[PDB]
């Protein structure tokens, strides 16, 4: 497992990526790690946002499957031609394995220009896979084709300040460690909510406090209509109710403060002079989960330094600004890089639960420490999933 720590470059405003490689000979390139989607792809052609991409004639080892595929994200969307061919991680366990690739000829607002990825690795389960579910995910072959055991977990550590976006590229922000845990890079307790169904992963938040205080809504409008856990996506994102529920609260709680209502959309920024982010003033924010045994929850708790984002000023100074990291969904609850960037994140796909504990990387408060605690009673939590 040591091999496999520190092998993501990258941070949640852009993605995490990982090294992998294609074809005999094999093609290096970098692939953005995303647990919300099941399609592994690649850049294939030339393209402004990329320095390098797949050349399927170079391959020895490229079949062709003479099937075309779309597949649309949140925010951007890609086509292109299904082939298979030879993949590792020269990080990742050193199994060479047959994989289903596609291959990108059209793209819209999904290549990120600087983030230094050429494609996406789709962690999640077949059922979401493009064109439909029998195009099997990456991880699936992995399994099947090796003796790699069915889990890997996230450690995502990002925005040491200040960052540098190419620098990112250059120094280190986080680890995945393929087929099982490793035990050095968190503290404490393992605590694992249920895999509810197994597509996007999906879980049942049960609570939601704020400071200490319950929002006191319907645990259905958590999860309305599924909550998912998804290191391809930078922001926590929040059914509608609920994200102007929270806003209202932590807009309270700063409310001593000037901001923009633009900003509390996350498109403006704000700005302190350096060192005087007045983080005190802002709220922890307390996700309780389902837990594993009846009756019983554990609660996963967010400091706002993972909810504002840093970003380099526009006017550059030596300012800290920061894009508020919280935004309005509609296609329910997103548990992004910003949530996760706390935690240790285990994807136990073989016991279908996904386990939380703090990291040993983890932003600092002078007064606050995000914690993963429990146990925590908890009645009728099944009645929180949506149907």
Known sequence: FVEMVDNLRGKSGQGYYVEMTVGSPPQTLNILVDTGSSNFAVGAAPHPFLHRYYQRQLSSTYRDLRKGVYVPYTQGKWEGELGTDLVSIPH??????????????????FFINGSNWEGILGLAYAEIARPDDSLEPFFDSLVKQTHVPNLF??????????????????????????????????????????????????????RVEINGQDLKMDCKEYNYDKSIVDSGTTNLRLPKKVFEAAVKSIKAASS????????????????????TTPWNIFPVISLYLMGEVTNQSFRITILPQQYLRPVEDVATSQDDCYKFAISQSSTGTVMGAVIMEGFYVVFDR?????????SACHVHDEFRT??????????????????
């Open 92 to 109: 990742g366990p050193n199994v060479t394995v047959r994989a289903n690739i596609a291959a990108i000829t059209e793209s819209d607002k």
């Open 153 to 206: 977990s996230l450690q995502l550590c990002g925005a040491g300040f200040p960052l540098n976006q190419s620098e990112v590229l250059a120094s280190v922000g986080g680890s995945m460690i393929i087929g099982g845990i490793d035990h050095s890079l968190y503290t404490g307790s393992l605590w694992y909510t249920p895999i509810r169904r197994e597509w996007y992963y999906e879980v049942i938040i049960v």
């Open 256 to 275: 001593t403060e000037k901001f923009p209502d633009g900003f509390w959309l996350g498109e403006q920024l704000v700005c302190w002079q350096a060192g």
């Open 350 to 358: 073989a016991r279908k639960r996904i386990g939380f504990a703090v």
């Open 370 to 387: 995000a914690a993963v605690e429990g146990p925590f009673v908890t009645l009728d939590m099944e009645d929180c999933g949506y149907n």
